[PDB]
Every structure is written in structure tokens, then in C-alpha cells.
Amino acid sequence: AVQVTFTVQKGSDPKKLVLDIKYTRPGDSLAEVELRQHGSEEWEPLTKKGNVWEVKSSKPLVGPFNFRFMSKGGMRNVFDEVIPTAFSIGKTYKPEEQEF
């Protein structure tokens, strides 16, 4: 199954999400992560910066936030409304795991 946690890192603000994403899928690993803002139709790629993933906007981000994952093995998962607009530095958001 795919298990994930998202921890909001210091440096995040209304225009910037810095996320420690811990992605667990046996024998696989994360390749891509994208954000879809609430009321938006486009997926915006997060940039991997070492231990964390980042997405910035020129305007405040609109949540709750949805995330699309693509594993190296080509497994797709979408986790919906995982982080609220009014997210909190240092808090972890942990959606239900997704069994294949």
C-alpha cells in the first residue's frame, strides 16, 4: 500500500509550502509530487530540495490542498484535501493509507 505523511516545515507561509513528505511504498519510491489548489484544475509540480519538497506561488495558496504522487515504478496516488489552508508549522498531516 502507499502510506504518506506531510510535515509542514519552518519557512512555509501563505505563499509557500515546504513539506517533509514521507512516502512509503514497498520496493518503490517517490518520483513526482504535484499540488492542486482548492478550486483550481491544474496540478502544480513541487520541487524536491533534499529532504523536503517545495511549492511557491506569487499569491497566497488556496486550500485545502490536494497532492498527486507518481512513484518511480509508475504508481499514481492522489490524496485529497490533505492540508488545510490554515496549516501549521511543524504539524504533520497523515491521510489514510491507500491500499492498491
Ligand SMILES: [Cl-]
Ligand atoms: Cl495494498
Ligand SMILES: [Cl-]
Ligand atoms: Cl492545522
Ligand SMILES: [Cl-]
Ligand atoms: Cl499500491
